[PDB]
Write a protein that binds this ligand. Structure first.
Ligand code: CLA
Ligand code: CLA
Ligand code: CLA
Ligand code: CLA
Ligand code: CLA
Ligand code: CLA
Ligand code: CLA
Ligand code: CLA
Ligand code: CLA
Ligand SMILES: CC(=O)O[C@H]1CC(C)(C)C(=C=C/C(C)=C/C=C/C(C)=C/C=C/C=C(C)/C=C/C=C(\C)C(=O)C[C@@]23O[C@]2(C)C[C@@H](O)CC3(C)C)[C@](C)(O)C1
Lengths: 168, 160, 220, 163
């Protein structure tokens, strides 16, 4: 486990709590799967939050009874004006995505998280052996960074203050 | 690991997989923590109910303040118009002294971690085959239910 | 334990000091050198491939000392040579005009603080990488400043004796500068003024003690 | 009978005969109490003086009750709410019952004679600190109950350069 990917040179293998110690293989796979899922979710959330704070909003973001897109605020407090049924619809859609589509529905398991539906490849065998490892790393690490960033944004939103760069 | 604690519709119930690796000492420690939390929870639930009813000890707690003057609930310990900090500290010290000098094992009754006979018992001797098992399934069970109940009471009194 | 070491000639020093590390005189009355200071909860520890305890303490000493060496000049310079030519077209509202060192920390843009913190973090990420990759062969300091093999814009070369002499000078200046920085900070805190405005008044005379002057007519 | 902590100023100092025969376990328990009480007294004497000049500037209750405002001495226990004392005692119990926030690198491995001398010194400094604490709280309570009594002014009658 001391040689798998994620051991970026800056720090190398880094396990301060040492939960791995003695372990089989399902534990490592589950940990990597949850880490990757959190990374993807946080990347998407951070991109959405930054693009909404940038100032540009969808002209078609309006909902029932008009509810002009410019009326909707930002942040956890700024999300308490969307219609209830719309949010329920969004949650139902995401839950459906978790129940179907967002899994390995072919049976190929070259690595954890390689769902691909075995049908929507955008060019995979083109890359070299090392390019696969590089892309998997560049992805995971940007996911970790997005996780930390979105947590900081959410915390400082409620704490009250003035973060640099971003207005707040 | 199938012992007292898995019964009543649902069997071995470990949704989060705490006991995936498991140990004898780890299981014993977790069971003791569960039992102690449950006992304290049921005692606190009974006390909160009885002080909600209206009964109060006679006399005064602090210098010029009767037992029936203090508020009922969370406000008794924290917030304005609460018991003086000195009295609460002394009661806490008494609780600690009794906990550390009364309910430890000083003889060697052993059996299960949490037995505090020290030669004093009523009927836990003559009875032996299985009444121990079903009784313990009661002691703990009730503890779980009363623990949930006291948590709910605190929730309601904080939000209500 | 050995007895009567140079410095504390009536005391004792642990057997772990020995020779080795430059700057060694034997000053260690308490201990701190006979305990596993580099092995207990170290997340970067490597069994059979790490440094010793005394070398770890030397690393800590060098870090604290270099920071203090920079800090002393940081305290003295702005008060005596004037402020930085900055604040032009920056909209700082005389941010750099302040000369009391304990007051400037409340008037600088946050970008400066974050730049400093990021630079320090980058430097010591590099230091951590070097420590991990150098194994149980630690040359102390590292970070690859001007010596052959590492970064060396000026191509500095030294004979081994000259290198040892430079190491001794560095460690002595580190210790003295730590003491000096501590003193400067607390003097300035208690006095409520920078060092120059505290020392310059006590240079010539008080105003209420000086004589009025010379008024004797000449030529009479 | 004859262990660490016997010094020439006296020779045994056991007037009441609280030991007499007892047993080894009882004497060991007594010594462990003498140490714990002494260490607590040292820390208390040290911490009774520090707030007189410095004071961390954090809020116990966010919004009110800043540490800059609460009085020093025995008047603090009335000012601090019960929850703070409960949390502090819980933290100390966490330190004591388990090994948390404790490191085995502080035990050191000094030789036998150095260890004996340092243990005796530790005991003596602790024993002095206990009586120091006694005078301190005596003066504080006497002055707080009725001002002007014991005409010496200010907390900490010694070290007058603080005020
Ligand atoms: C002077 C008083 C005193 C003393 C000396 C003790 C001594 C002891 N108690 Mg104890 N206790 C006391 C009073 C005292 N008790 C009182 C008044 C109560 C309430 C009736 C309890 C309830 C209690 C329980 C329920 C347990 C103990 C346990 C223990 C033992 C270990 C405690 C420990 O590790 O530190 C405490 C160390 C900690 C790290 C504390 C953890 C605090 C948790 C994680 C947070 C709980 C939530 C918090 C209270 C509220 C959150 C608010 C929310 C808004 C976030 C020890 C014998 C434990 C035991 O026997 O171990 C098996 C145990 O399970 N005690
Ligand atoms: C965690 C995921 C997440 C969640 C919960 C939301 C939630 C929300 N987004 Mg959003 N968004 C996301 C990801 C997310 N987004 C990503 C990844 C992007 C980049 C493509 C955007 C780009 C985006 C824009 C440009 C706008 C929103 C808006 C909104 C709000 C109204 C819903 C809407 O119009 O959806 C729109 C969803 C998308 C455009 C793509 C989602 C995939 C709502 C609070 C709108 C709003 O009210 O702004 C305040 C709006 O104008 N989002
Ligand atoms: C978790 C357990 C717990 C705790 C923390 C308290 C705490 C408190 N009770 Mg209480 N009580 C309890 C269990 C508990 N009780 C139980 C089980 C009963 C039923 C017998 C009572 C019956 C009771 C009465 C009738 C009164 C209190 C009162 C009080 C308050 C002041 C007097 C005091 O310190 O206790 C008093 C200690 C006892 C009554 C001893 C109980 C026997 C022990 C638990 C065995 C104090 C906040 C008084 C008060 O001011 O009401 C708010 C009061 O008049 N309690
Ligand atoms: C569901 C509630 C419940 C039940 C069924 C029990 C039952 C029992 N407890 Mg228990 N207990 C409870 C609540 C309960 N408790 C609470 C709330 C506390 C906290 C104060 C405790 C604290 C406690 C301690 C500290 C100990 C017990 C013990 C015991 C057992 C002692 C057996 C004995 O001496 O022979 C009794 C036999 C009889 C025939 C007597 C009948 C009594 C007549 C009917 C009245 C007994 C079966 C002891 C034990 O075994 O360890 C857990 C023990 O040391 N209990
Ligand atoms: C936080 C993340 C982060 C990271 C990892 C980096 C990393 C880097 N930056 Mg950078 N930067 C950051 C944030 C960050 N930056 C921010 C927020 C800004 C402002 C927008 C900048 C502005 C910036 C500029 C302008 C430059 C860099 C440069 C660099 C590179 C060399 C840094 C160097 O050697 O400085 C070494 C710095 C020092 C040795 C200064 C140390 C001074 C003392 C001794 C430290 C004392 C710290 C003190 C104890 C803290 C308490 C005091 C405090 C209360 C004020 C390196 C890749 C340089 C480069 O070449 O990159 C292209 C460059 O020119 N950065
Ligand atoms: C008997 C011990 C004792 C007790 C009961 C208190 C109690 C109190 N102190 Mg206090 N204090 C103590 C010792 C003590 N102190 C010591 C020894 C010092 C010197 C450092 C101080 C310095 C001090 C200041 C400067 C302030 C207080 C304040 C307070 C009050 C607010 C609570 C707080 O923040 O405490 C904080 C308590 C501590 C910091 C004591 C920590 C002692 C532990 C044992 C240190 C453990 C090691 C440590 C984590 C670092 C490890 C080093 C490594 C080499 C091992 C409270 C009444 C504040 C106040 O409002 O005053 C009224 C305040 O501003 N205290
Ligand atoms: C993430 C962890 C965490 C959280 C959520 C809190 C939360 C809180 N702390 Mg806190 N604290 C923590 C960690 C934490 N603390 C740690 C690590 C320390 C250092 C030891 C402290 C030291 C500390 C102090 C010194 C004070 C707080 C206070 C508070 C409360 C703020 C005021 C308030 O809400 O009044 C509402 C308060 C209440 C309703 C009363 C709460 C009673 C507590 C939670 C019971 C504790 C029981 C104990 C843990 C276990 C039993 C005793 C044990 C010996 C057996 C709040 C509940 C302040 C406070 O209590 O103000 C009243 C306060 O003065 N905290
Ligand atoms: C939850 C908190 C907690 C817990 C579980 C303990 C637990 C213990 N303490 Mg203790 N202690 C605590 C907080 C705590 N302490 C605090 C906050 C202080 C103030 C500094 C002390 C001061 C203290 C002293 C001075 C002594 C103990 C002693 C003891 C031990 C026996 C106690 C006894 O005989 O009955 C009570 C026991 C391990 C005694 C001991 O170990 O020797 C007999 C002892 O002499 N403790
Ligand atoms: C209230 C919390 C608390 C308490 C009571 C203790 C208590 C203790 N710690 Mg500890 N510790 C704590 C928090 C705490 N710690 C935290 C948060 C950390 C950081 C994670 C540590 C890190 C730590 C280390 C690394 C060591 C201890 C050690 C110790 C023991 C001796 C303390 C000593 O010699 O220095 C206390 C000294 C003072 C208070 C002097 C103050 C002088 C002032 C500040 C000068 C200005 C003692 C059991 C030592 C030990 O057990 O060695 C055997 C040890 O090596 N602790
Ligand atoms: C010498 O020492 O003596 C002997 C004396 C004696 C008497 C023999 C002994 C004893 C035995 C004892 C004390 C046994 C005690 C057993 C005990 C005390 C058992 C409690 C159960 C509580 C439950 C199930 C609560 C459920 C609570 C529930 C399920 C709730 O959620 C309730 C509620 O809450 C909410 C959420 C909100 C309200 O709107 C609505 C409802 C109410 C829905 C001892 C120690 O042996 C000592």
């Amino acid at each position: 486990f001391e040689n798998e990917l994620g051991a970026q040179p800056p720090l190398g293998f880094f396990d301060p709590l040492g939960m791995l110690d003695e372990a089989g293989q399902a534990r490592f796979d589950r940990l990597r799967y949850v880490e990757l899922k959190h990374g993807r979710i946080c990347q998407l959330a951070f991109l959405g939050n930054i693009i909404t704070r940038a100032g540009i909003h969808l002209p078609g973001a309006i909902s029932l009874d008009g509810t002009k897109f410019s009326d909707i605020g930002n942040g956890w407090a700024g999300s308490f004006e969307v219609p209830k049924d719309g949010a329920l619809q969004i949650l139902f859609f995401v839950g459906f995505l978790e129940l179907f589509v967002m899994k390995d529905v072919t049976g190929e398991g070259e690595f954890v998280g390689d769902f691909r539906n075995g049908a929507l490849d955008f060019g995979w065998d083109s890359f070299s052996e090392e390019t696969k490892l590089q892309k998997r790393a560049i992805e995971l690490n940007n996911g970790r960074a997005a996780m930390m960033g979105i947590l900081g944004l959410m915390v400082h939103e409620q704490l009250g203050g003035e973060l640099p760069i971003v207005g707040q | 690991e199938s012992e007292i604690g898995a019964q009543a519709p649902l069997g071995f119930w470990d949704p989060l997989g705490f006991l995936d690796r498991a140990d004898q000492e780890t299981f014993d420690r977790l069971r003791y923590v569960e039992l102690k939390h449950g006992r304290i929870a049921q005692l606190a639930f009974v006390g909160n109910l009885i002080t909600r009813a209206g009964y109060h000890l006679p006399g005064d707690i602090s210098l010029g303040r009767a037992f029936a003057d203090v508020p009922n609930g969370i406000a008794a310990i924290n917030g304005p118009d609460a018991i003086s900090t000195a009295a609460l500290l002394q009661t806490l010290a008494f609780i600690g002294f009794l906990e550390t000098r009364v309910m430890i094992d000083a003889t060697g009754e052993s059996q299960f971690r949490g037995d505090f006979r020290n030669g004093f018992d009523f009927g836990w001797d003559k009875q032996s085959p299985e009444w121990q098992t079903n009784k313990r399934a009661i002691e703990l069970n009730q503890g779980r239910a009363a623990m949930m109940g006291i948590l709910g009471l605190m929730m309601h009194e904080q939000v209500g | 334990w050995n007895e009567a070491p140079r410095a504390l000639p009536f005391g004792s020093a642990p057997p772990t000091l020995d020779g080795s590390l430059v700057g060694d005189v034997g000053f260690d009355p308490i201990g701190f050198s006979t305990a596993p200071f580099a092995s207990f909860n170290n997340p970067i520890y490597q069994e059979g491939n790490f440094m010793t305890d005394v070398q770890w303490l030397r690393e800590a000493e060098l870090t604290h000392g270099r920071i203090a060496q920079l800090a002393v000049v940081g305290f003295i310079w702005p008060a005596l040579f004037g402020t930085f030519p900055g604040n032009e077209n920056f909209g700082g509202a005389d941010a750099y005009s302040y000369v009391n060192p304990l007051e400037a920390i409340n008037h600088i843009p946050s970008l400066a603080i974050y730049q400093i913190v990021g630079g320090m973090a980058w430097v010591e990420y590099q230091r951590v990488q070097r420590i991990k990759e150098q194994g149980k062969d630690r040359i102390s300091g590292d970070i690859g400043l001007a010596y052959p093999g590492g970064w060396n814009p000026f191509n500095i070369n030294y004979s081994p004796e000259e290198y040892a002499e430079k190491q001794l000078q560095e460690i002595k200046h580190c210790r003295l500068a730590m003491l000096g920085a501590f003193g400067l900070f607390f003097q300035a805190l208690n006095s409520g003024e920078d060092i120059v405005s505290q020392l310059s008044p006590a240079f010539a005379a008080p105003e209420y003690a000086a004589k009025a002057g010379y008024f004797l007519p000449q030529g009479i | 009978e004859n262990e660490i902590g016997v010094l020439p100023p006296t020779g045994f100092f056991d007037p009441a005969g609280l030991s007499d025969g007892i047993s080894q376990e009882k004497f060991d328990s007594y010594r462990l109490a003498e140490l714990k009480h002494g260490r607590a007294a040292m820390l208390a004497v040290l911490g009774y003086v520090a707030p007189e000049t410095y004071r961390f500037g954090y809020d116990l209750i966010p919004g009110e009750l800043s540490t800059n405002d609460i009085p020093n001495g025995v008047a603090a226990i009335k000012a601090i709410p019960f929850g703070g004392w409960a949390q502090m005692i819980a933290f100390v119990g966490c330190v004591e019952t388990y090994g948390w926030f404790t490191s085995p690198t502080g035990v050191l491995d000094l030789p036998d004679d150095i260890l004996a001398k340092r243990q005796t010194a530790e005991l003596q400094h602790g024993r002095l600190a206990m009586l120091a604490f006694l005078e301190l709280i005596r003066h504080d309570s006497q002055n707080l109950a009725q001002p002007g009594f014991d005409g010496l002014d200010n907390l900490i009658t010694g070290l007058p350069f603080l005020y």
